[PDB]
């Protein structure tokens, strides 16, 4: 299957409550492997997966140093963003960064990412070409000018085509037991009456990895998109994920409804019904 590595930055200002907090988390697909928090007693990069513990002491030193320096850089960024939007030093603000690479089954680069946001709104984004930028507004346009002069896109390109894919290939090999294992969902349909003439059919998907999954209800082989209640995919706490789809159904007509399940752990898509 295909794979991805992502790092997520969150820099949060907190006037009156000390210097801005800087947090970094790293992921391979939907598995957390590394963590940094500037509010920790001894701030450093910490392992969150067994297959990253292997890495030598030099790896951990470099990674920590990057985070400690980024803590300083993103504090400067928050100050810079205040001038760009003419804001006071009294409010709390958040800069977020989302970057990494996707690789194909062969381990070759599919595409790279590097995008930022300010207060939950898109700020700047590196385009798929890994050489041009998209700025959301005139503030980020100033950042764009600064990055184009400093040949920043070219530095991303070299990383995304170089170190990003190289390390992700190593991580996938070392953690092959889990990262290259797809756990299929366990599925069943529940039945709860609402009225005397209305029943809720809920299609469960439990214990599946990765998170990507499709659950659809069909009435006589016809999709019920606008009539299906579909909750967000939630983590179970053991690496796996959970999801359910529900439909309000007239009693007697339960056998006209079929749940359809799509997940990479299944060789074929599953069709299930309420089994009385």
């Amino acid at each position: 299957g295909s794979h991805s590595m992502r790092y997520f930055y969150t820099a949060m200002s907190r006037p009156g409550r000390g210097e801005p907090r800087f947090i970094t988390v790293g992921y391979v697909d939907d598995t957390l492997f590394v963590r940094f928090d500037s509010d920790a007693t001894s701030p450093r990069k910490e392992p969150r997966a067994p297959w990253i513990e292997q890495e030598g002491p030099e790896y951990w030193d470099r990674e920590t140093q990057i985070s400690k320096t980024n803590t300083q850089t993103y504090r400067e960024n928050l100050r810079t963003a205040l001038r760009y939007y003419n804001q006071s030093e009294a409010g709390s603000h958040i800069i977020q960064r989302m970057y990494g690479c996707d690789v194909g089954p062969d381990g070759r680069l599919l595409r790279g990412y590097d995008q930022d946001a300010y207060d939950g709104k898109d700020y700047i984004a590196l385009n798929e070409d890994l050489s041009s930028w998209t700025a959301a507004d005139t503030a980020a346009q100033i950042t764009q000018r600064k990055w184009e002069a400093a040949r920043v896109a070219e530095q991303d390109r070299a990383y995304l085509e170089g170190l990003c894919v190289e390390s992700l290939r190593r991580y996938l090999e070392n953690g092959k037991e889990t990262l290259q294992r797809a756990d299929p969902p366990k599925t069943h349909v529940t039945h709860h009456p609402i009225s005397d003439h209305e029943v809720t059919l809920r299609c469960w998907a439990l214990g599946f990895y990765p998170a990507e999954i499709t659950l659809t209800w069909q009435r006589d082989g016809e999709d019920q998109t606008q009539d299906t209640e579909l909750v967000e995919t939630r983590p179970a706490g053991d690496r796996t994920f959970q999801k359910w789809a529900a439909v309000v159904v007239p009693s007697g007509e339960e056998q006209r409804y079929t749940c359809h399940v799509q997940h990479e752990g299944l060789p074929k898509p599953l069709t299930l019904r309420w089994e009385p």
Partner: peptide, 9 residues
């Protein structure tokens, strides 16, 4: 592995 060099806003 993280990208070493970062750029100011």
């Amino acid at each position: 592995e993280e990208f070493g060099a970062a750029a100011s806003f």
